[PDB]
């Protein structure tokens, strides 16, 4: 079936907390915090998605989970560009990082919303 609304929120809290930390690091130009923030966010997002089936039956759940997971992966994909092992544009980079964080938060709400109606 579906997880409870209370459980979804409970997992969402750890997601928003880490995204806030990411936004905080972006405002202070602490780009070295981008990678570990994306790691924290990914792990929190992963735990949230674990509440829902791997292959969900409903369509809104399937689409929201897809966006949630892809954005989380896309987030640490962008954050990985902060460290070139061997020129880095932080302006273009931070724009993409925030948009990913937004998409994660957006998909998180969609999951809470569809769960509330079923409660």
């Amino acid at each position: 079936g579906l997880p409870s609304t209370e459980d979804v929120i409970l997992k969402t809290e750890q997601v928003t907390k880490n995204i806030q930390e990411l936004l905080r690091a972006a405002q202070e130009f602490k780009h070295d915090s981008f990678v570990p923030c994306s790691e924290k966010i990914h792990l929190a997002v992963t735990e949230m998605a674990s509440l829902f089936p791997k292959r969900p039956a409903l369509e809104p759940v399937r689409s929201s989970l897809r966006l949630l997971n892809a954005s989380a992966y896309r987030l640490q994909s962008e954050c990985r560009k902060t460290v070139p092992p061997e020129p880095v544009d932080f302006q273009l980079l931070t724009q993409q990082v925030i948009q990913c964080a937004y998409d994660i938060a957006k998909a998180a709400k969609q999951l809470v919303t569809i769960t509330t109606r079923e409660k």
């Binding site: 929120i9 969402t12 936004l23 302006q91 937004y102 919303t113």
Partner: peptide, 21 residues
């Protein structure tokens, strides 16, 4: 309640995006 706080974050993220634009 909980929906609002997430809306606050989304608003904050979108608000910050304009600052870099």
């Amino acid at each position: 309640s909980a929906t609002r706080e997430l809306d606050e974050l989304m608003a904050s993220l979108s608000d910050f995006k304009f600052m870099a634009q």
